[PDB]
Design a protein around this ligand. Structure first.
Ligand code: K
Ligand code: K
Ligand code: K
Ligand code: K
Ligand code: K
Ligand code: K
Ligand code: K
Ligand code: K
Ligand code: MG
Ligand code: MG
Ligand code: MG
Ligand code: MG
Ligand code: MG
Ligand code: MG
Ligand code: MG
Ligand code: MG
Ligand code: MG
Ligand code: MG
Ligand code: MG
Ligand code: MG
Ligand code: MG
Ligand code: MG
Ligand code: MG
Ligand code: MG
Ligand code: MG
Ligand code: MG
Lengths: 46, 163, 49, 160, 278, 207
RNA sequence: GGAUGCGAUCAUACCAGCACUAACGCACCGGAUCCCAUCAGAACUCCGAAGUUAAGCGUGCUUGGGCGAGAGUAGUACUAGGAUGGGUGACCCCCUGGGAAGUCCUCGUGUUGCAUCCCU
RNA sequence: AGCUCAACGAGAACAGAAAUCUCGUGUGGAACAGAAGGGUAAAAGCUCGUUUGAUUCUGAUUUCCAGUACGAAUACGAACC
RNA sequence: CAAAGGGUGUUGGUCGAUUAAGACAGCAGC
RNA sequence: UCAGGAUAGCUGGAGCUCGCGUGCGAGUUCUAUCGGGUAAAGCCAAUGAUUAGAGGCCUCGGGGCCUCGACCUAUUCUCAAACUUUAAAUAGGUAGGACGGCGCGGCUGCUUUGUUGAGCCGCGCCACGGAAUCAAGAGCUCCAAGUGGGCCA
């Protein structure tokens, strides 16, 4: 029916793969009110 | 779904501590959360809104968003051969500020001054910590020696308090 | 676990040998592969040979 | 012990008429209290349905009214006068309270007289803010209530 | 028959004590939580509470902000210090509450160095007032914390609220609870509200007793008579007090815990006495 | 009828006591756990001997009653009806199931048994020093009623109390012992002082 | 040294009984015209200041209960790894490591922030 | 917004084990539509007042998981209440 | 593959009792 | 749909982007910190189950003043996958720098009583690599096979 046998072995053949971490992360899902003002702040930045 | 509800197997994990029920102390609501801070997720059983899934209970994550009543938290989750960066929003009642990096900031300053002091005198050093190493030799003053020997066996003593 | 630790010690073959500095970090690693290894304190003669 | 703030007084007088059934009788019984006390009585409802007593749940089966001040004293002496200023020793509760019942008094209805005795300062247990408990020494005891009844109305306590 | 002890060992083992302020009957933590909880995206933005408390003989007003170590007092005003301004009697009535609220409003604005910009209401006519925002600065904002009292129409707490509003403070509110508001008409009667601000209701009662029960007037208003205050002269007094406020706003007697040695010595004496008995 | 005891000798399942989940459980065979003069005072029977289990096994309630009856009869004849107190120290709270193909094989409750551990006392007898031989012999007969291996150990404690015989006399001579029927209460130095009696108040704990 | 207002920590702070308190307070307390409030001016609300520290609040005490801490229980129970270890088995010793919990015993009974006021 | 429940103790004409009324104790031993678990005491329980956020517009996230859908839930944004 | 339970088979060990003031067996008249 | 298929995983081929110990990687430990309710333990703690006496014997029933049982107090034997105050071992999460820190300025329609915050930007300065061990290196993409009956300790 079911078993986890050998599944950890399969995962470790090429894993465990950590996601690539970049200096800047996506802003999707953050507070739109904060994001909208930040866009205006960069627009008038000088 | 698919044979298990959202809060299945949470009889103990989501229950309040003994004699620690009722009103939540207000220091919880006076905490300040900033982007990049580390927080430990601890579900409070009394607050039923914004509560994370049982998996995230007892996990430490990084704050990536702040809302009126909740903080966005990034938690690593291992799925087969990959680690996923799970982004969840949690009400601040379920999060505690973690002390996992409490020693970092103070350590950096001490390292900076030690290098600065060594730089002025032209002596290259290393500020790295080291694990416990072997102890040096030393002398111990003699004292009365207590002799330890095996005890004769007694069946009557093979029970807490004896028979 | 044992397989990983022996690799970190560079013991990939039976009867291979290596030196190891003594500290709590290394000693605790060695404690976890006890039945697969034997070790001790080498004298000057042993290191020379 | 002789401080003026330790003087006993009648906090309130409660007249209860448990007719045991709704309808015209309850309406007439309520009118008796209103004229006897001068204020609108309250209609109590049965907590549980009991077929033996013939009362259904959430049905008005009794009426009572609370009286305070001079009228409580005026309406209390009348009850004791009918009772001949004599009460049984068991009629006094351990919490400094006592009561009696008359069966003569629309019609004729039997009333239930209960008196609550309190010293000044009982507000501490009644106020909303800083609600507390009255000191044990300051509470009215069973003995204190008996002495008050024996000096206020020079009554007699029959142990029987 | 013998009754089982209700408060046994098991009862106390599992008993959880409420918060000290709750079991002392002084703090409603449901209200407090919703008063001090600030939006997390506002960070260290204090949420000030206009705390008004009434005692049997005094009125306490405070501007309070919450912190982990405890509440911080920005400004305070007591009705007991109103005699410094002229008000000698009735330090707990509706008019005194208005004066106390006004004094706090001018003091906090004085501390914030913005009292010149916001002078408050200059025409106290009993109408609902709210200080309009200035040009280069918004008015100070605070929230009313009434405590455990009942928020009834005409309550003294709303009299202090009106004084704070007339002093130039922004306090969210409505007119449904000011003195003079009518439940049926759903309107605020300015004349009645103005009457309470200057103690007109107090003056009316003083005149009623004089005409009907002069003996009761002497006792019920002994302090008023002792200081030569008449019913018709109360309105002028409060107006003078309001102008004054805007012009310029260890031996031990308790026993000490016995030391371990002292307590043990007394225990031995009792123990020996009990043994020597019988 | 009932299966041979070897079928359920080994402790293989988690405890399965009678509860709202397991219904229709037959009553245990053993219902009496104290025999003899059970009203005798603590000071009457100083001697105490135990029949101690030496294996981890299940003991059926049927065997427990059989051992009690066998031990009781010999002791009554050998020593008398009022010269001993026998107490069964084990209660059967585990329910055994029986499956009367393998589809839906979860069995119905058959009987009850006791989950005994190594070194656990099975039976205890207290009497006078003069009847020590009879008490040990009575437990010997009861040993043949149990499935595993037991052992006879003479207790160093006073009867069924938790105090050693030397300590019991030491405390009793100091007037620190308050009889409580078969039990013995030791007076310390705690509680309300007025509760104690003139000759029963102490400054230091009994050590 | 304390009280009061708002608090933080939420029993070392709770519960029970007994005892005690200068000053300012805080209370109890007086009244029911007005706002408000009920069967009920008890409560809530408004106005007031004759009386009392009786209670509340505060402090102390108890071979008090509870709670907190230590010791001990105990290197015991259990447990990670090891053995062509013992044993018919059930189970158990030893090797490289980790390591509890009632009873019993001793001790403790809050600490503290802002503001105002009394002791001054 | 106010209130405190189950239970017990001591009292009151008819009235009793059990009607209603009074005081006291009462950490929830009650209640919260239903299974069980968790949770809740100036409340999430009980009684009253006013009401329709059981509304409109997308997107994001969690649970399921292939990191697809559906169901369900959560945190925001922009409106109207 | 073997059990409970047994052996005055034999080998170790543990507790107690008796014995040059004469034990034990047999013999003798305690 | 259950003798099948697709899907992900495991696998090959094709490479590409870099790197040469200054690696930012690790089925390991160390240090710091966080979560847990199994083993054991507990009932002399809640809930449930359960044995016996002792004292008090007020008040309720039982029978014959006596008397047994109910009751109350302090003890006591023995228990729980769907009980629990407490509570391991093993295992689980996070962190240990150059994507660091500080100073001086600037931007905003968001936020504040408040150039008060929040995030971001510019300039200047500092930063011996900031635990151990190892690192037959690290990352990324494409196309596709087989497999989707397992069995043993
Ligand atoms: K299930
Ligand atoms: K046997
Ligand atoms: K409410
Ligand atoms: K009550
Ligand atoms: K042999
Ligand atoms: K335990
Ligand atoms: K129990
Ligand atoms: K396939
Ligand atoms: Mg499906
Ligand atoms: Mg699944
Ligand atoms: Mg409120
Ligand atoms: Mg099984
Ligand atoms: Mg009154
Ligand atoms: Mg006093
Ligand atoms: Mg104590
Ligand atoms: Mg439920
Ligand atoms: Mg929803
Ligand atoms: Mg054998
Ligand atoms: Mg085939
Ligand atoms: Mg494929
Ligand atoms: Mg842990
Ligand atoms: Mg579990
Ligand atoms: Mg469990
Ligand atoms: Mg267990
Ligand atoms: Mg196939
Ligand atoms: Mg298959």
């Amino acid at each position: 029916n079911h078993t986890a046998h050998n599944q950890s072995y399969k995962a470790h053949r090429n894993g465990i793969k950590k996601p690539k971490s970049h200096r800047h992360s996506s802003t999707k899902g953050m507070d739109p009110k904060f994001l909208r003002n930040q866009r205006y702040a960069r627009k008038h930045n000088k | 779904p698919a044979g298990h509800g959202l809060r299945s197997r949470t009889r103990d994990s989501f229950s309040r501590a003994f004699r620690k029920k009722g009103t939540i102390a207000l220091s919880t609501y006076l905490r300040i959360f900033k982007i990049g801070d580390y927080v430990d997720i601890k579900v409070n059983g009394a607050i039923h809104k914004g509560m994370p899934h049982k998996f995230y209970h007892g996990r430490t994550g990084r704050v990536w968003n702040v809302t009126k009543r909740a903080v966005g938290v990034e938690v690593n989750k291992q799925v087969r051969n990959k680690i996923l960066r799970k982004r969840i929003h949690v009400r601040i009642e379920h999060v505690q500020q973690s002390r996992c990096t409490e020693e970092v900031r103070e350590r950096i300053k001490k390292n900076d001054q030690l290098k600065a002091d060594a730089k002025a005198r032209g002596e290259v050093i290393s500020t790295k910590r080291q694990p416990l190493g072997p102890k040096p030799g030393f002398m111990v003053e003699g004292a009365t020696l207590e002799t330890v020997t095996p005890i004769p066996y007694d069946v009557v003593n093979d029970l807490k308090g004896g028979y | 676990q044992t397989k990983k630790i022996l690799q970190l010690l560079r013991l990939r073959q039976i009867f291979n040998g290596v030196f190891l500095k003594v500290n709590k970090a290394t000693v605790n690693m060695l404690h976890r592969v006890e039945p697969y290894v034997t070790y001790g304190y080498p004298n000057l003669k042993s290191i020379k040979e | 012990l002789s401080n003026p703030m330790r003087d006993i007084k009648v906090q309130k007088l409660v007249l209860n008429i448990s007719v045991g059934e709704s309808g015209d009788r309850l309406t007439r019984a309520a009118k008796v209290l209103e004229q006897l006390s001068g204020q609108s009585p309250v209609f109590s409802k049965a907590r549980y349905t009991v077929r033996s007593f013939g009362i259904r749940r959430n049905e008005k089966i009794a009426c009572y009214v609370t009286v305070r001040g001079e009228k409580a004293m005026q309406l209390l002496e009348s009850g004791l006068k009918v009772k001949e200023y004599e009460l049984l020793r068991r009629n006094f509760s351990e919490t400094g309270c006592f009561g009696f019942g008359i069966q003569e008094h629309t019609g004729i209805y039997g009333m239930d007289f209960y008196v609550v005795l309190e010293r000044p300062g009982y507000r501490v247990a009644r106020r909303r803010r800083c609600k507390s408990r009255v000191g044990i020494q300051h509470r009215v005891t069973k003995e204190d209530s008996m002495k008050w009844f024996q000096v206020k109305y020079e009554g007699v306590i029959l142990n029987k | 028959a013998f009754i089982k002890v209700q408060k046994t060992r098991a009862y106390f083992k599992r008993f959880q004590v409420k918060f000290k302020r709750r079991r002392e009957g002084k703090t409603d933590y449901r209200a407090r939580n919703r008063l001090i909880n600030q939006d997390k995206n506002k960070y260290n933005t204090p949420k000030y509470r206009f705390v008004v408390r009434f005692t049997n003989k005094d009125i306490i007003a405070q501007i309070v902000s919450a912190s982990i170590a405890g509440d911080m007092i920005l400004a305070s005003a007591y009705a007991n210090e109103l005699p410094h301004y002229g008000l000698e009697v009735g330090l707990t009535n509706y008019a005194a509450a208005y004066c106390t609220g006004l004094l706090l409003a001018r003091r906090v604005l004085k501390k914030l160095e913005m009292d010149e910009e916001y002078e408050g209401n200059l025409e106290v006519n009993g109408e609902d007032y709210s200080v309009e925002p200035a040009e280069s600065r918004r008015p100070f904002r605070a929230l009313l914390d009434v405590g455990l009292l009942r928020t009834t129409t005409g309550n003294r707490v709303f009299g202090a609220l009106k004084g704070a509003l007339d002093g130039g403070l922004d306090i969210p509110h409505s007119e449904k609870r000011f003195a003079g508001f009518s439940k049926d008409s759903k309107q605020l009667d300015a004349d009645v509200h103005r009457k309470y601000i200057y103690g007109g209701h107090v003056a009316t009662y003083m005149q009623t007793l004089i005409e009907d029960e002069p003996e009761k007037y002497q006792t019920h208003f002994s302090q008023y008579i002792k200081k030569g205050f008449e019913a018709d002269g109360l309105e002028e007094m409060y107006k003078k007090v309001h102008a004054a406020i805007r012009a310029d706003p260890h031996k031990r007697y308790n026993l000490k815990k016995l030391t371990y040695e002292e307590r043990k010595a007394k225990l031995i004496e009792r123990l020996n006495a009990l043994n020597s008995a019988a | 009828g009932r299966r041979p005891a070897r079928c359920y000798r080994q402790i293989k399942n988690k405890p399965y006591p009678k509860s709202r989940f397991c219904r229709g459980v037959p009553d245990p065979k053993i219902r009496i756990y104290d025999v003899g003069m059970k009203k005798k005072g603590v000071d009457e029977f100083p001697f105490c001997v135990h029949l101690v289990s030496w294996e981890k096994e299940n003991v059926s309630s049927e065997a427990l009653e059989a051992a009690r009856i066998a031990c009781n009869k010999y002791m009554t004849k050998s020593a008398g009806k009022d010269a001993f107190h026998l107490r069964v120290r084990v209660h059967p709270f585990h329910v055994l199931r029986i499956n009367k193909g393998m589809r839906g094989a979860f069995g119905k409750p058959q009987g009850v048994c006791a989950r005994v551990a190594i070194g656990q006392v099975l039976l205890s007898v207290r009497c006078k020093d003069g009847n020590a031989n009879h008490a040990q012999e009575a437990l010997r007969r009861a040993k043949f009623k149990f499935p595993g291996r037991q052992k006879i150990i003479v207790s160093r404690k006073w009867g069924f109390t938790k105090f050693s015989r030397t300590d019991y006399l030491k405390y009793k001579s100091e007037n620190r012992i308050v009889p409580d029927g078969v039990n013995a209460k030791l007076l310390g130095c705690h509680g309300r002082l007025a509760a104690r009696q003139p000759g029963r108040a102490f400054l230091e704990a009994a050590n």
